[PDB]
Design a protein around this nucleic acid. Structure first.
Ligand SMILES: [Mg+2]
Ligand SMILES: [Mg+2]
Ligand SMILES: [Mg+2]
Ligand SMILES: [Mg+2]
Ligand SMILES: [Mg+2]
Ligand SMILES: [Mg+2]
Ligand SMILES: [Mg+2]
Ligand SMILES: [Mg+2]
Ligand SMILES: [Mg+2]
Ligand SMILES: [Mg+2]
Ligand SMILES: [Mg+2]
Ligand SMILES: [Mg+2]
Ligand SMILES: [Mg+2]
Ligand SMILES: [Mg+2]
Ligand SMILES: [Mg+2]
Ligand SMILES: [Mg+2]
Ligand SMILES: [Mg+2]
Ligand SMILES: [Mg+2]
Ligand SMILES: [Mg+2]
Ligand SMILES: [Mg+2]
Ligand SMILES: [Mg+2]
Ligand SMILES: [Mg+2]
Ligand SMILES: [Mg+2]
Ligand SMILES: [Mg+2]
Ligand SMILES: [Mg+2]
Ligand SMILES: [Mg+2]
Ligand SMILES: [Mg+2]
Ligand SMILES: [Mg+2]
Ligand SMILES: [Mg+2]
Ligand SMILES: [Mg+2]
Ligand SMILES: [Mg+2]
Ligand SMILES: [Mg+2]
Ligand SMILES: [Mg+2]
Ligand SMILES: [Mg+2]
Ligand SMILES: [Mg+2]
Ligand SMILES: [Mg+2]
Ligand SMILES: [Mg+2]
Ligand SMILES: [Mg+2]
Ligand SMILES: [Mg+2]
Ligand SMILES: [Mg+2]
Ligand SMILES: [Mg+2]
Ligand SMILES: [Mg+2]
Ligand SMILES: [Mg+2]
Ligand SMILES: [Zn+2]
Ligand SMILES: [Zn+2]
Lengths: 129, 149, 95, 99, 144
RNA sequence: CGCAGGUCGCAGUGGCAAGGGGGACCUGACUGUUUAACAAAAACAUAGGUCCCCGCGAGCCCGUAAGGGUGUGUACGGGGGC
RNA sequence: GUAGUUGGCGGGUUAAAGGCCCGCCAAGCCGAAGACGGGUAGGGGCGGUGAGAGCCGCGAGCCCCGAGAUGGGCACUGAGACA
RNA sequence: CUCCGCGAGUGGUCGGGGUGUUUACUGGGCUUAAAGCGCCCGUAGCCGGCCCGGCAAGUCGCUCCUGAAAUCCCCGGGCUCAACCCGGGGGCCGGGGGCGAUACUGCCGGGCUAGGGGGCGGGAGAGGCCGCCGGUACUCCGGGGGUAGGGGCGAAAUCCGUUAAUCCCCGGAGGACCACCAGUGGCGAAAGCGGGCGGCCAGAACGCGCCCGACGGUGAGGGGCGAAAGCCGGGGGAGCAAAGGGGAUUAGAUACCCCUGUAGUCCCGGCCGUAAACGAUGCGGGCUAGCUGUCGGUCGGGCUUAGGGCCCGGCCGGUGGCGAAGGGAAACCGUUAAGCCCGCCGCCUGGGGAGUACGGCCGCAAGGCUGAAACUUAAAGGAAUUGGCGGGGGGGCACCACAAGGGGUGAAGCUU
RNA sequence: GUGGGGGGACGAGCAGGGGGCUCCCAAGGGGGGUGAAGUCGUAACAAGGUAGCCGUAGGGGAACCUGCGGCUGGAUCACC
């Protein structure tokens, strides 16, 4: 039984990137998936994102730019604080200048850089590098 | 069985992504509702009524034309099933299996099928009690539920 | 270590097999894992010059199958100990 | 599985006498003897009356008949029953053939 | 064969219970929790004990080695148990006499069990009548 | 059938009537029978087990014989041993 | 598992609420989210160790709270002790 | 004798931490090394589809009242520096109040169809229970033919036979099984299921603009089914056959071979509850090159033993083979994962002691389930390589082998 | 202020059973296990000389043998 669409979509993207495909189709989807893809595209890891209106909830076709070295959804969705962002940073990312964590906050889903800029915390979602 | 089945099939109908009224349809929504109530009074269950509308009358789907569901239409037009259709079907299946098991007491495959059917009945009763579609005091007693067969 | 991916018998997706009895034997195994070698068979071979086309003498031939366990199949030379590379070669067992 | 005892139920009238094997044999026969049986005539699940050994009576339809010493029908006696009372099975056979 | 097991965000207590269940597979944790050392050890958890020497004995070294390692039988004062204690050092047995009070001490070796080639000896003598056998052997002290 | 209170004696099922109890071995399973008049038992019997003679014009037994018992029976039976 | 046990009502006692105790009334209360039973132990600030998560209690000494004064009970005085 | 390490210390034994990714949240493993319960139903728990609206419980931000002191971290200062003392900030992982935020989780309401269930249609299947029937084979019995052997083995012998055997024919009775077709073929959760016809059931796959609208996963505890052997009672008994008897062989032969033979094997009701119950591979879902055999359904084309048929191509669902990426100690797995992930359950933590002892529960019994420690030990173990060996296979060669031959030695006397 | 009899709550102590959890002691066993090689055979490793192993039942100086079902971890990945 399908449980987490976010982890499903992220691992599908990782499998397509490992196979060196140009585009990955993501079904089922939700707004969390859309905002995560938006953050990835903003940081350049994911290319163009096309919506498809099939009757069964919608699909996302994502273009891959050869930029991902490893992707994945942090599960469980740990509540993290602004002072606690840095240890999760070192836990999931290589190098202090490489990669980003994705966080869901009360002002919306953003990267760990934007969360540290806003001086907020939230729920960890995924990592990219 | 429910768990560890040998095969896991995909058989199901693929409907249009957003169903709409057919342009070629010669039946208005009110006529659709009267046809459904006619088939209900004849005695068909809702799945069979939908198949009859699709096949004999060319009605693709009641929901786009009328905006309602088939059981909602039947409920509005004075048709109210005793129990929900799937629960009643499962109970009738269990009663038939028990009648068979009365004359064949060593049918272990039949006993396992009866256990599967009764477990399905229990899950459906839990759901219907949670959603209020059945009374919260309802209990599956096959000896007192013989009238539904 | 697991020799062979077959388990030593091409049994198929089932739990138990009907199983047979070995010829010159009875150790045997199920329907699979046994050898079923077939021979042409006929009574009195090359008398067809002195019979058949003499008198009227109409003879009959009867294809015959013999079932052997692994021990007898190795014993009468119907099975050899092939190398690891040749273990996966598909050859017929000399009819 | 009995009213007040675990295993020695109908033989509970014997107390601790006569031995476990003897009491087990008696219990095994008596549980079938004193149970409910299907009457050969009316097919009702009824406690038939054993008037003597081999003489059985149905209180529902009044069928009086000869059967086993302690059970109304023995294993051999079931196969050699009179054909008058096996009318239902003959009707079932003719219905299954004709339909 | 997939996904540890209780990984949920509200599976903390279940995960703790599951991890606590499998700590009893560890011999060290079970021994420490059940107090087997303080039940079955002749020393009873002490780093050393006292005893009275009863007889002088010689154990045979294990198969590849050829030697008669010389020990004593010592009866512990606090428990009364009689155990074989190795007497180390060349000529160390000659400083030991019957009915002499000795300090019995763990022989070392893996996990407090027997040493290299001596079979089934767990203790050794450290003191003889209040004077250390090392000092007696080295001549720094004389046995009283 | 019960509850509350008061009260006497050494003694309240006050006379009459009315189990001492427990542990272990041997032995016979048990209830039952036995040497009327010195033996009541561990002896006999017992249900249960097993073997044998017997298909009935049998097997076994009684009678001099006529004939008889088992038998108004029939191997899920009759008789005979252990 | 529990039978003053769980609760209610009316009282006594107390400096004061309370099955704290008492009279009546009901069957209630706890338990596999582990009762009950057994074992171990004074609790905390804290301490050792490891890069850290963590593990351990050397959770002896120092500070705070608890209990006790050979074992078990019961009282006097007094604001306060069952000292 | 000399050198090394630390030094007013330096060693021994213990206990804790490190060691140890050998307790694994970070962060282990369960095909074969220890480890998936024999299989399935399901309670608590944990984990759970999409969209919209409300809340603001978790969550996040700020703030306040607090979390005694000492202790701990940073800074300044004072003891000759130091250790230490003094002064300030932080923490001391938490509780509560106030004000905010709404992405995520939860709750409440409404709406969906993607997972799940219920359906309709034509097919597939050794799926099950029940009844009736057949096929040859077999054993036995009765009669007819015809003599004297048969049966067995490496060789025999026991054994069967002259009251006529083995072999042939004509009849009858009985119990088991369902040859070929027939397949890494099918069905089933596992155990397991193979003759035909019929009846009564069950469970899947396929096709579908059918119905409900998340009703789902896993599942401790709790259950139910569960080979063979075995046990209880009844029936049956052809063949085979533990135990047993006999004939052989051998040093022995209480085995291996032969003759015979009882439980048992079969049926009915119950108990047992175990197996190399194995894919040694828990169940659910998603993603990740392909090529090829076969099974079911379905669609397109071609043909037609004009048939429910055959061939080619696509999809869905099984079942085998090779093999991308990837994984692995390796054998090897590889869309039927042992790959990349998301859940939940069970199990493992060196070997022996030991599936032992005790306790409990279950069983008519055999026994079963659960399941240690003392003590002892430095390995036990997995996969693969080279060799050695084999009463496994194949090839080649040799008068220090054989074959075809010649001369001999081994016996006598003597030399050695 | 008292001295008797009685009742009441608390309540030691001594008499006793009841149970449990512990711990020792015992003539004798009872299954075991470690040594060092002492006797008897040769059961496993090679188609280990009767392929092996699993459960079960019977039998035997003993390793073990035999019956039934199962597995290959077989010495067969292979009919026509
Ligand atoms: Mg549920
Ligand atoms: Mg099997
Ligand atoms: Mg050692
Ligand atoms: Mg009197
Ligand atoms: Mg008597
Ligand atoms: Mg008497
Ligand atoms: Mg007398
Ligand atoms: Mg007398
Ligand atoms: Mg007698
Ligand atoms: Mg007897
Ligand atoms: Mg006799
Ligand atoms: Mg008051
Ligand atoms: Mg109280
Ligand atoms: Mg470390
Ligand atoms: Mg002090
Ligand atoms: Mg006191
Ligand atoms: Mg005092
Ligand atoms: Mg490990
Ligand atoms: Mg293993
Ligand atoms: Mg399994
Ligand atoms: Mg198990
Ligand atoms: Mg098992
Ligand atoms: Mg909040
Ligand atoms: Mg300070
Ligand atoms: Mg603090
Ligand atoms: Mg402080
Ligand atoms: Mg389940
Ligand atoms: Mg369970
Ligand atoms: Mg059986
Ligand atoms: Mg027989
Ligand atoms: Mg025979
Ligand atoms: Mg297994
Ligand atoms: Mg592995
Ligand atoms: Mg492969
Ligand atoms: Mg076990
Ligand atoms: Mg036991
Ligand atoms: Mg080699
Ligand atoms: Mg020659
Ligand atoms: Mg000579
Ligand atoms: Mg051998
Ligand atoms: Mg062998
Ligand atoms: Mg034998
Ligand atoms: Mg024999
Ligand atoms: Zn064979
Ligand atoms: Zn009747």
């Amino acid at each position: 039984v399908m449980l987490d669409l976010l982890s499903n979509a992220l691992t599908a993207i990782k499998n397509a990137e490992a196979m060196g495909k140009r585009q990955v189709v993501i079904w089922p989807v939700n707004k969390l998936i859309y905002y995560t893809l938006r953050v990835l595209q903003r940081y350049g890891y994911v290319g163009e994102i096309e919506y498809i209106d099939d009757g069964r909830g919608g699909k996302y076709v994502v273009q891959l730019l050869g930029k991902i070295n490893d992707i994945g959804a942090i599960r469980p969705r740990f509540p993290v604080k602004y002072r606690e962002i840095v240890e999760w940073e070192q836990k999931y990312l290589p190098a202090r200048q490489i990669g980003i964590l994705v966080i869901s906050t009360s002002q919306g889903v953003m990267s760990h850089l934007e969360a540290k800029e806003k001086k907020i915390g939230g729920v960890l979602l995924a990592y990219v590098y | 069985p429910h768990r560890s089945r040998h095969k896991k099939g995909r058989s199901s109908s693929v409907r249009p992504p957003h169903p709409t009224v057919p342009t070629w349809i010669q039946y208005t929504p009110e006529e659709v509702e009267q046809l459904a109530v006619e088939l209900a009074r004849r005695g068909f269950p809702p799945s069979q009524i939908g198949i009859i509308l699709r096949d004999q009358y060319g009605i693709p789907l009641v929901k786009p034309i009328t905006g309602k569901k088939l059981t909602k239409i039947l409920e509005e037009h004075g048709i109210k099933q005793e129990l929900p259709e799937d629960l009643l079907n499962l109970i009738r299946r269990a009663l038939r299996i028990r009648k068979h098991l009365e004359e064949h007491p060593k049918d272990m495959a039949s006993r396992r099928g009866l256990q599967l059917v009764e477990s399905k009945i229990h899950r459906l009763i839990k759901y219907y009690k949670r959603v209020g579609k059945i009374p919260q005091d309802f209990v599956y007693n096959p000896e007192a539920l013989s009238h539904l067969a | 270590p697991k020799k062979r991916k077959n388990r030593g018998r091409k049994k198929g997706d089932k739990g138990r097999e009907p199983y047979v009895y070995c010829d010159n034997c009875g150790k045997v195994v199920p329907r699979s894992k046994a050898i079923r070698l077939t021979v042409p068979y006929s009574p009195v071979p090359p008398d067809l010059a002195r019979e058949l086309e003499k008198q009227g003498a109409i003879i009959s031939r009867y294809l015959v199958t013999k079932t052997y366990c692994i021990n007898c199949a190795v014993f009468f030379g119907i099975i050899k100990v092939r190398p690891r590379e040749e273990r996966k070669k598909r050859v017929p067992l000399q009819q | 599985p009995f009213s007040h005892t675990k295993i020695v139920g109908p033989a509970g009238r014997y107390g601790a006498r006569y031995g476990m094997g003897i009491r087990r044999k008696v219990t095994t026969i008596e549980v079938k003897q004193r149970g409910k049986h299907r009457c050969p005539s009316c097919r009702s699940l009824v406690r038939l009356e054993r008037l003597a050994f081999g003489i059985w009576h149905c209180p529902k339809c009044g069928h009086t008949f000869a059967g086993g010493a302690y059970v109304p029908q023995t294993i051999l006696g079931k196969t050699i029953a009179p054909e008058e009372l096996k009318g239902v099975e003959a009707e079932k056979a003719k219905w299954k053939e004709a339909a | 064969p997939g996904k540890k097991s209780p990984y949920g965000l509200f599976a903390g207590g279940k995960l703790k219970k599951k991890r606590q269940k499998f700590r009893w597979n560890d011999v060290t944790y079970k021994r420490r929790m059940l107090g087997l050392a303080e039940k079955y050890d002749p020393l009873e958890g002490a780093p050393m004990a006292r005893g009275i020497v009863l007889e002088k004995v010689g154990v045979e070294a294990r198969k590849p080695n050829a030697a008669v390692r010389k020990c004593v039988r010592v009866q512990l004062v606090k428990n009364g148990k009689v155990v074989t204690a190795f007497v180390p050092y060349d000529g160390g047995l000659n400083y030991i006499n019957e009915h002499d009070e000795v300090i019995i001490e763990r022989i070392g070796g893996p996990e407090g069990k027997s040493l290299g080639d001596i079979p089934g000896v767990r203790f050794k003598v450290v003191k003889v009548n209040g004077v250390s056998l090392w000092a007696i052997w080295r001549g720094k002290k004389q046995k009283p």
